[PDB]
Design a protein around this nucleic acid. Structure first.
Ligand SMILES: [Mg+2]
Ligand SMILES: [Mg+2]
Ligand SMILES: [Mg+2]
Ligand SMILES: [Mg+2]
Ligand SMILES: [Mg+2]
Ligand SMILES: [Mg+2]
Ligand SMILES: [Mg+2]
Ligand SMILES: [Mg+2]
Ligand SMILES: [Mg+2]
Ligand SMILES: [Mg+2]
Ligand SMILES: [Mg+2]
Ligand SMILES: [Mg+2]
Ligand SMILES: [Mg+2]
Ligand SMILES: [Mg+2]
Ligand SMILES: [Mg+2]
Ligand SMILES: [Mg+2]
Ligand SMILES: [Mg+2]
Ligand SMILES: [Mg+2]
Ligand SMILES: [Mg+2]
Ligand SMILES: [Mg+2]
Ligand SMILES: [Mg+2]
Ligand SMILES: [Mg+2]
Ligand SMILES: [Mg+2]
Ligand SMILES: [Mg+2]
Ligand SMILES: [Mg+2]
Ligand SMILES: [Mg+2]
Ligand SMILES: [Mg+2]
Ligand SMILES: [Mg+2]
Ligand SMILES: [Mg+2]
Ligand SMILES: [Mg+2]
Ligand SMILES: [Mg+2]
Ligand SMILES: [Mg+2]
Ligand SMILES: [Mg+2]
Ligand SMILES: [Mg+2]
Ligand SMILES: [Mg+2]
Ligand SMILES: [Mg+2]
Ligand SMILES: [Mg+2]
Ligand SMILES: [Mg+2]
Ligand SMILES: [Mg+2]
Ligand SMILES: [Mg+2]
Ligand SMILES: [Mg+2]
Ligand SMILES: [Mg+2]
Ligand SMILES: [Mg+2]
Ligand SMILES: [Mg+2]
Ligand SMILES: [Mg+2]
Ligand SMILES: [Mg+2]
Ligand SMILES: [Mg+2]
Ligand SMILES: [Mg+2]
Ligand SMILES: [Mg+2]
Ligand SMILES: [Mg+2]
Lengths: 75, 96, 64, 50
RNA sequence: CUUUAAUGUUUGAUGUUCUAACGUUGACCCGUAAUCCGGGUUGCGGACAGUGUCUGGUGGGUAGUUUGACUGGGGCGGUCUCCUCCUAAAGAGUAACGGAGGAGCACGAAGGUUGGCUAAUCCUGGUCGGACAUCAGGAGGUUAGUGCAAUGGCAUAAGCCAGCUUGACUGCGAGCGUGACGGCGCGAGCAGGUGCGAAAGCAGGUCAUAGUGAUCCGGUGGUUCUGAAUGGAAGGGCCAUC
RNA sequence: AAUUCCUUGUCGGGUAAGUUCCGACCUGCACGAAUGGCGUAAUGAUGGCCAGGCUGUCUCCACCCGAGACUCAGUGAAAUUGAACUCGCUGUGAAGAUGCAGUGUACCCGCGGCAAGACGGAAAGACCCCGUGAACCUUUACUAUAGCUUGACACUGAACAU
RNA sequence: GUUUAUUAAAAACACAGCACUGUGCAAACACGAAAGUGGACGUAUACGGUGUGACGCCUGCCCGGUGCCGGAAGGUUAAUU
RNA sequence: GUAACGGGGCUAAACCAUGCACCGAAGCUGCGGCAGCGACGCUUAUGCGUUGUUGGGUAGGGGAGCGUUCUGUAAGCCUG
RNA sequence: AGGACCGAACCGACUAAUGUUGAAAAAUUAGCGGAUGACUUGUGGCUGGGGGUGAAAGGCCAAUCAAACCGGGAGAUAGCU
RNA sequence: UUUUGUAUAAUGGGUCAGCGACUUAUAUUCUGUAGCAAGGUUAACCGAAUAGGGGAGCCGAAGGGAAACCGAGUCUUAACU
RNA sequence: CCAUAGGUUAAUGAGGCGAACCGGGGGAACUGAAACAUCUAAGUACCCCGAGGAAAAGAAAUCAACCGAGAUUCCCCCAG
């Protein structure tokens, strides 16, 4: 009565903290906002996070709910 | 084209276009040629007589294909914007 | 024996200046209403045969 | 399915049309919406909902 | 001109009659010392039967073939596509007829935006108050909620309500992510034009990941791109689309 | 039951002992009236069971006559066969060993016998899967189609009523 | 009686008998593109097919499906016009 | 058929421990030799004396070769 | 008188032993069934291959039959060993 | 030979000698190489015959776009940053 | 009845054979489409009929493109 599963969506982190990226490069594919867009980083309709500027990826935890935020500082 | 029972790319992908019936009677001429017309007049058929385009061509252009030498009178042929400057920058003459 | 072309190959591909082949996208034919306008915009323009697929179409088009 | 495809026709002669869906039971009237006509380059009113 | 009859003609139908094609495996004559055959006469029939052309029905009589794969042999049973979790060994992927569930839809607002809003459930008190309709008090703090499966999200709310509306806009596209492939997906910004706002701004569909169908053949509709001598035309093309 | 699964059903009958047979009962897994029902004297190299006869079928084999085996001469084949300096046991290993390992046993060659083994000979398994294999058969599979049938024009016309 | 010559002789096929059903004779059927032969130089007390199997006593119930006989008014209905 | 130390045998020839020797491989090393590539020592159509290294191998891929039979150079060259 | 009876020649083939590189590509030896009939046999003739002929076993069609024999398309196709 | 693996009790060969398995044709494409080179070669066909003649034609120098066309551009779009 | 059949006789010829092209009359399937029924194999294999040094085609109701090429069987392009 079983016998089913779903195809893997290849999510996870594509660019980690400390990596040079251009603008538009995808950094994380996600379902919810496990990670949030921080300063100079943008959010697409499926919560895919992408670079809005050339620079290096930076993971930090900020604010009162200890959420993970990803930003990009220009280099 | 066999790719296994799978639908090959040429069936996988769609057809496009039609053939208009014009490519076979329209030729293009380069500047490295035109001086070989052994008569100094560039017409519709001089080039045919010299075996440079082909017997059934009915329209010809000139394009800018480099080196322009002897002065020529290009008659009954179209000339591109660029080509007119090269033909005249060495004299020649254009007329419809 | 002159070679014979797989003639259906010749009606979907045309060879470009350097040696690849340009082609039309699939799915553009019917059942368009459900498809997003953006998706159709990037599918209207032509594309190149990929590197993995060149190794056979070329087998199919010796006179292209 | 149980939701029909319709065509919206531009109320400016152009032959541009949009396609969408409709619950024809629950929504029996003719749907009417401003859309961009790429031929007249303006947001014109669109009709039809068969 | 409006309307109809007559007749002649024309042919349509229904029957009756005729005889000349058309049948005769009725009798006789002749080629002739012939159960063939022909011609001849005569009787019987006669526009029928019978045969050719085409057309609707029938047709294992006879022909060609098809009659899936997987699978702890095969068959039986079940599965075949998508989605979520899981085994999956803390990046991606990962197997079996392993373990649990779902999708083949919905929405003109259950969409954009502007302003603005906050659940579940204990205790106590209260008209008909019943364990639990409804008003009130605090305790409580997203267990609520999300159009539905799971997961991750959710308070700046993605949840709930409204006024205004259509950006579910057409053109595009830096850069990527995922694919053997076809493809699939994310997107700041640009022109045009738009909605809402005082504005900064936010909008290129629905919290997101299912909601599915390539190629062909053909169908609409616009497009002067093509038009087999020429002008149109037909068919071909592209865009939209079924 | 030529049908009965359960089943060697149950009951009586024969026997010392009767999963069959004979008789019956009815609970007919799942008889039936021309895909005939029941019953029938005669016939039957037909199937089942029993009895007097007869016995080497047997208990359990003894003895005899001949043909081949066997010994000489004459003539003279066969399948099979990588190669042979072709043993027991145990264990090992493509999992059942004349060839490996350990270990035991054995002077070298015939002729007569047996057939346990050589996963013996013979046959590119007849079961079994698989090949988008093959061939005859079937039918309310598909698709065409002979034969049969419907008509339509033609061969094929002339009158009259309506 | 008959049978699988060449492992099956039977409970199998046949048989007389019985039933159904087609057949008016240029029969029906059957061979053959067709001519023409069989049927039969017979003519329904005769011939074909099908089912059953001597003699005896007998063969019930169902016409919904299925397949055949008959029906002809209405429905759908091809070529052609 | 001993048949659950490979055997005989073993009271250590068993086991724990600490030591110290010794056998043990196509590995390492030694000696002689070949090839591949790599560079120098130097010049040269280099080759080495060298000299670092490297050389198990199915399918499969690369590379250099042996010989047969037939033609030519070959009325040349062998050969009673 | 009878597809009556017992039973040789004749015809056929139920049982067993041998025979299985046999004497023999089914036969011999001991019995078997029928033997005036739907009998048995000589000589000729006729049926031709999705066709024949069959008292029906897919039996027989030259030691071959779920499609005989020769030659042809032909080196069919062989994803298999 | 085949396998994951074979003394394997899995297949093939009894022994020998001879025969016995990647060819021929035309295309088209890469390589090594030759000639020639913005040009490279002619095909038939003529024949003094492999010589010489024969550029019809085919490959290339320029391609973008279905096509119109435009051309070192061009296709997109009303135009593109 | 005329007539035609029918009959009789002379002369003349035709009768059948053997490769191949040709012309025409008949005409498969395997195979390929990795099934197979449209299409393929192929107007091929085969049948027959006939025939010459060849046969058959043959002299524009053919093409062209507003200029013109001019019977017709064949060799290479066009051109997969
Ligand atoms: Mg040329
Ligand atoms: Mg379209
Ligand atoms: Mg059949
Ligand atoms: Mg299977
Ligand atoms: Mg993981
Ligand atoms: Mg209360
Ligand atoms: Mg026209
Ligand atoms: Mg159109
Ligand atoms: Mg009893
Ligand atoms: Mg007894
Ligand atoms: Mg009855
Ligand atoms: Mg019965
Ligand atoms: Mg009975
Ligand atoms: Mg008898
Ligand atoms: Mg002797
Ligand atoms: Mg081993
Ligand atoms: Mg053993
Ligand atoms: Mg013996
Ligand atoms: Mg063996
Ligand atoms: Mg054996
Ligand atoms: Mg086998
Ligand atoms: Mg026989
Ligand atoms: Mg026996
Ligand atoms: Mg009868
Ligand atoms: Mg019967
Ligand atoms: Mg009726
Ligand atoms: Mg012990
Ligand atoms: Mg050593
Ligand atoms: Mg050394
Ligand atoms: Mg090596
Ligand atoms: Mg008698
Ligand atoms: Mg007798
Ligand atoms: Mg017998
Ligand atoms: Mg027999
Ligand atoms: Mg005898
Ligand atoms: Mg006898
Ligand atoms: Mg005879
Ligand atoms: Mg056969
Ligand atoms: Mg063939
Ligand atoms: Mg063969
Ligand atoms: Mg194996
Ligand atoms: Mg292997
Ligand atoms: Mg052995
Ligand atoms: Mg084997
Ligand atoms: Mg072996
Ligand atoms: Mg062998
Ligand atoms: Mg096929
Ligand atoms: Mg076939
Ligand atoms: Mg002629
Ligand atoms: Mg003229």
């Amino acid at each position: 009565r079983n016998g089913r599963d779903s195809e893997a969506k290849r999510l996870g982190v594509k660019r980690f903290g400390g990596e040079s990226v251009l603008a538009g490069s995808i950094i994380v594919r996600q379902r919810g906002t496990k990670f949030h867009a921080g300063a100079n980083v943008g959010c697409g309709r499926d919560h895919t996070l992408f670079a809005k500027a050339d620079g290096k990826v930076k993971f930090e935890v900020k604010g009162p709910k200890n959420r993970k935020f990803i930003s990009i500082e220009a280099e | 084209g066999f790719e296994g029972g799978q639908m090959p790319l040429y069936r996988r992908l769609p057809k496009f276009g039609f053939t208009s019936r014009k490519a076979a009677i329209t030729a293009e001429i380069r500047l490295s040629d035109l001086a070989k017309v052994e008569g100094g007049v560039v017409d519709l058929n001089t080039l045919k007589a010299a075996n440079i385009i082909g017997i059934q061509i009915e329209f010809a252009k000139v394009i800018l294909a480099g080196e322009v030498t002897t002065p020529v009178t290009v008659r009954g042929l179209r000339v591109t914007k660029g080509a007119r400057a090269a033909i005249e920058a060495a004299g020649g003459k254009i007329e419809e | 024996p002159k070679i014979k072309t797989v003639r259906g190959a010749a009606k979907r591909f045309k060879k470009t200046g350097k040696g690849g082949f340009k082609h039309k996208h699939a799915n553009l034919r019917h059942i368009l209403t459900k498809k997003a306008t953006k998706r159709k915009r990037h599918l209207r323009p032509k594309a190149m045969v990929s590197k993995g697929d060149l190794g056979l179409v070329i087998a199919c088009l010796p006179y292209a | 399915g149980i939701r029909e495809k319709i065509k919206l026709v531009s109320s400016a002669g152009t032959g541009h049309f949009y396609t969408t869906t409709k619950n024809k039971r629950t929504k029996p009237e003719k749907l009417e919406l401003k859309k961009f006509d790429p031929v007249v380059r303006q947001h014109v009113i669109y009709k039809e909902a068969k």
